[PDB]
Point group: C5
Chain length 268, copies 5
């Protein structure tokens, strides 16, 4: 990664620090570790408070997608527990439930849900989902019609309707939550203040080290840079929880984890 | 944007051109007390920086709940009362006015323009004549829900479902007004911001013996770190304000209007 | 409060004048042990300040819920029973009296005058004849909701909607009583106040070795930083007091009163 | 208490450090303070993260006993608004709610609740309570029958039963929480490491302080030891809030405030 | 203290003594200032890691505590609404106990076959085990048992709705217990911190032999053992559903759950 390919830049700066210092006493400039000890601790504190604030954003993103699996489990569970014979209406409500997660992933992955929506639904309902400015929310609205048309039919009482209605709210905070994380990210004034302070601290660190470390400088400076640049790279992976990176959320595999449950909850 | 930190560069350079009075007026300023003082300050600045971010998160979570609540509320009307679009455009218009009137209550601005756009003048005067306009709007939306209670159009259960989502909006109002009135006492932030700069200006006075001519480079680089982690924390304690890293409340109310209006049909 | 640092400059002034003799018993004082000691204090002073702030937030969070619960409860009355405006003015007074007695319960004041202002004396005398007066108000307001259920005006469902709004008010009482009756760091705060005062006074004795006569200039600045972070750290753990304390419940207790009265129509123009 | 001994033992090691200071400079060992700042700060960092772990557990312990206070209030209040005349059932559910608080306090103090059960309940029901595994859970089950025997007879609707039922679950989440705070203690595999890292640092610090401060080490070493030894000893009572510590929860007084409240809602 | 690598920290300390004197050449020197700053920088990051992992341990305990509480209240509501239908009692309890055990086997990745055959008929064990997420098949079967009491007219939908809210408390745990064991913090950080902690502990004695020649092995381990310990706790708290009996005793909680529901009948 860019961390590792720029961890090399301080090694030459350390040897540059070694090969310099010969005109230092003429100019009259000296660089010790005491100001960088103060500065380094101040940076490591701010990097730590920035990392734990980022970790919660990773946890909050993780909890919202975990609730989807919980809500749809119980919703299909309640449909097979209150209306066990309406297995014709089971697979319709399920199909909307499957479309929401995929449309959620494609809405958070900024891709095209057209291909995945036609797989589960007749084309009539796919464009109806695509006709609104928020297709996922149209699915929640569409899921209500399959639940709502059963209310006036006398199959579910108004309480049994409200109890299943209370399971779309758990689903509704997820869409409203995942949409909220990607539009209000951690204020960029944060990562830029740390990467501007970490990189500039890492480059000027060997200039403070060879006055006390002499030739052992490149070994120590890189080990301190590696610690900061790795601790900083953690903040860069927590900011993309819905992306395609090598170490992100496997949302394609998580939509798969949700689909195999509901389909085994009805038929196969 | 900066606190003219260049003045510490002059304060660092002043120590250099004064350093000629080093042993004559008998001054020693070492790094250990300023390291102790500086580490203690960066420790105290770290706990405040995360604390302001938390106030920022609570405001965004409340505004996200607003988008979710009105999302679900307009949805519940479309599943139980599929034909009652005469009451939709009234309940929706009240819900949209709630968001705009809330933002103007937190910005201490005038909500007159946005209310006349969505509601009739006769009821706009009804809203503006009260000491709590948002709760009066939420109260007005309840009348449109209450007039739907009637006797048999919505069951006794079904009213409670919409009542259980108007209170979700009310816990937002009680919080957002609480965040805009419950901050750190404006005498404890003041003692903290003035302590950082006093460490910031006297830091080069102690760094000359160590960093002779390299003093302004480190003094500014430590100034930049301390003055930034403190000045950004001053942007997050008022997420309803006009700061850079503030909540762009204009665009969230705009996103809610485009949501409900796309739900009308 | 302020002269503690003037005592600290004097400790430096004494430290300056009591160090030319600093050889009686062979003794030297360095800054490194006080850096470790000071950094450990800044770690512990930082963790103690965060605990006080949290109880301050819960005091605002619980008192913020007071505004919401009484709003939602009174608003619920104007959407289901808009014509029974006679029962509005009774529940409101209880909700207004609940907040006032809630403020009066935690400040250890006499709620008689504000209860005589808002309630008839028969309910004032019975409430003041109880030790837990606030819990009686929600119970008295609960009968107002129960009598509307027993008469046929509120269904078994709709009663439960308003009962869940008196419970939000009931969870407020038990929490505000919990923060004000068990401020747990009881008597153990002086782990820092006795250490900071002792650290700040012995600091110039360790600083006058490096900073000779310039010691008070730094000595007050490090003492000012620790003792100000300390006086702030114990101002927030009592979010119901006077002086600089940032909770002014009277303006919040009045605002809930003026809100429900403005939600019921108490400013008519003839 | 057991930190004044370590402080008295820490003063004695400093006097040994002075009278041995002349012995170990020939032995061929030298001791500076610089590792002890890193080690002490590393310990001072760990004492801060552990104190936050104990303090959070104490607040949760206090909140559960506040929740018992609130839930039984609402349950007694909900009973006085739906069945206000059923005072034959008032003193029965109140006694169950009161016995619940006491039996829980005896369950966390690991004593025998028989004595307070004969005071509040009929003796035959004391035999029934003691014949179960969890005595507290048997009490709330008894409170449910008094609500349950009122529903099937026609006095409580299916809805109004749930309104009071939703307040016994609030009491049940307390029992499992109070059970979790006790049955699942904070991970104490480090408390012994904190006994071993702090005292060995506190005792060996004056051996490193006698290098710079000659006679002033016992004055300084205690000020560093007392500050270190205080922050750890405070963490030892806050992680055990159901015991008989000086900061512990005075559970005796909480049951009294709960009983005197519920008794004040029943005409006394 | 099972760290055999803490003894490995001692060996370079004597090497540091025999080398400090043998290789001052070419200017390379190791002083204490960079490793003190670096050590504090690590101790800051190790503290933020333990509390983040510690919360993962706490969240794991609450999920199993909610399982204990949820099954309690569900049984409480049934003996207060249907005290006479004890023929149906012996069925639901077995599912909740089978759910409790099957959840522990799902997080421990062990075999629940015997645990289900003790409680359920072979035909229903074949139905549960011949499917994905057997715990959810148990809760779905437990839901079927509640639906038949509404369809029987024995439970109103209101009292049914009172009980339905308790299958979600168990389902939010299952979906929650699935979350803690499947997506922890990325491993690419576990090793870079294990490579940063162990490499810092081994390179410390080369930096300690300044004026600390003979006292080096005593301090290096006391700092390394202290560092190697505070990191090792975060490695047990990050996997609270793992093999470590000192992490979570699911056997002691699943049995404690069994002892309660079985104690309402004997
Ligand atoms: Zn089916
Ligand atoms: Zn419409
Ligand atoms: Zn509310
Ligand atoms: Zn009215
Ligand atoms: Zn409650
Ligand atoms: Zn009574
Ligand atoms: Zn529960
Ligand atoms: Zn039975
Ligand atoms: Zn749920």
């Amino acid at each position: 990664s860019k961390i590792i390919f720029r961890l090399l830049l301080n090694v030459l700066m350390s040897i540059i620090a070694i090969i310099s210092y010969q005109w230092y006493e003429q100019l009259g400039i000296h660089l010790t570790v005491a100001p960088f000890s103060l500065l380094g601790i101040a940076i490591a504190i701010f990097l730590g408070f920035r990392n734990s604030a980022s970790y919660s954003r990773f946890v909050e993103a993780r909890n919202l997608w975990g609730t989807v699996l919980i809500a749809e489990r119980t919703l299909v569970r309640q449909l097979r527990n209150i209306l066990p014979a309406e297995h014709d209406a089971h697979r319709r409500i399920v199909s909307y439930l499957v479309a929401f997660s995929w449309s959620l992933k494609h809405q958070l992955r900024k891709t095209d849900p057209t291909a995945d929506l036609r797989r589960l639904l007749p084309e009539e309902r796919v464009t109806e989902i695509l006709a609104s400015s928020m297709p996922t929310n149209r699915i929640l609205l569409l899921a209500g019609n399959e639940i709502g048309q059963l209310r006036e039919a006398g199959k579910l009482s108004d309480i049994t309707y409200g109890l299943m209605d209370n399971k779309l709210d758990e689903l509704a905070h997820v869409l409203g939550g995942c949409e909220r994380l990607a539009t209000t990210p951690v204020p960029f004034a944060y990562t830029l203040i740390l990467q501007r302070t970490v990189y500039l601290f890492c480059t000027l660190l060997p200039f403070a080290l060879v006055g006390d470390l002499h030739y052992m400088t490149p070994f120590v400076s890189v080990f301190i840079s590696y610690t900061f640049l790795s601790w900083d790279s953690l903040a860069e992976e927590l900011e993309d929880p819905f992306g395609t990176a090598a170490n992100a959320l496997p949302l394609n595999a998580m939509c798969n984890t949700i689909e195999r449950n509901l389909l085994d909850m009805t038929g196969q």
